[PDB]
């Protein structure tokens, strides 16, 4: 579709069996959830952000579907303020901004 | 144009009469800038993201051109990393997520 930013660009993704709500957010080179319980091996990694850096779970080739439309890649979980849909798996699902 | 998602999306910005490269942030409410001396009364605020809060100086109604598309509103400056050009001003300039 096309996403208006007037508001936040929330949407409803499906990862592990579960449906959540994540922000598509361009800003962002990857995706970096809440805590959650995900299946599969994970390594340590770090993340830095505006407010510094912040220890979180790499897991890679995870099933991912952003409104229907499903990516296949690396997920970031650990102390997000929101949970956040990065360029790694926009670029998977075809998104461009344009203006 | 047409922005992908390959790289960071990064554009030439003209603020206070300074030229400058930021990130089209559909993840971000808000603009935030990089250290500068802008005139002007400001007051201060703190914003949170990845990592914790940084305190910023919020100027209101500021002029900023994004790739020759001028925008104004508010304009929050202080230690980030990067410039972010936040929904705020992303909709003054025509700007959509599309996938
Ligand atoms: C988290 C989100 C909800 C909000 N943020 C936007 C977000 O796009 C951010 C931008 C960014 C920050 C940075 F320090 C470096 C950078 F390169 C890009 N990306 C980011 O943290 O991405 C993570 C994951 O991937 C990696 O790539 C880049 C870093 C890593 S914010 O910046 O916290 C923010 C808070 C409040 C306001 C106003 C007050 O409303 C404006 C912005």
């Known amino acids: ?4 930013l007037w508001k936040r660009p ?3 993704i499906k990862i592990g069996g579960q449906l959540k709500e994540a922000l598509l957010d361009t800003g962002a080179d990857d995706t ?3 805590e959650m319980n995900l ?6 990694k770090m993340i830095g952000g505006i407010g510094g850096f912040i220890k979180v779970r ?3 080739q995870i099933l991912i579907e ?4 499903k990516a296949i890649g690396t997920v ?5 303020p929101v949970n956040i849909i ?5 670029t998977q699902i075809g998104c461009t901004l344009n203006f």
Chains 1, 2 share one sequence.
């Open 39 to 44: 299946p599969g091996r994970w390594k340590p």
């Open 66 to 69: 952003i409104c229907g439309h």
């Open 10 to 12: 929330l949407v409803t």
């Open 86 to 90: 990065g360029r790694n798996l926009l």
């Open 32 to 34: 970096v959830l809440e």
């Open 58 to 60: 790499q897991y890679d």
């Open 76 to 80: 970031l979980v650990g102390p997000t």
């Open 1 to 4: 579709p096309q996403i208006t």
